Design a protein around this ligand. Sequence first.
Ligand code: CL
Length: 124
Amino acid sequence: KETAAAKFERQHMDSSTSAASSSNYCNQMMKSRNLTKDRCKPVNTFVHESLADVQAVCSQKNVACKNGQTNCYQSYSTMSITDCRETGSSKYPNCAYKTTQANKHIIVACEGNPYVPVHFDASV
Ligand SMILES: [Cl-]
């Protein structure tokens, strides 16, 4: 019974490093966050900012989510993030990922009391 908010943290927060420093980051991180247990999660973004900075996005620029709901928010500023996407050859359970480090806005869906990120929608 992971809360939605806890699952967001597990899948998307990496406040421990300022940036991915190697092309192996995603392989490493997708494994360790247990995102390849039953299947290779195809796409996943990690954010290298404080939890407070990411939660704060729920008070920033209100936008529509990909799914048409309107509980999404875009960060006013760029954030250090790392995009992880499964390579075309990748085959469970030898999950393999392309790592791309970047500085982009994040868009998250927020829910609850407290009103916190529960879904990563996109980076811009
Ligand atoms: Cl879910």
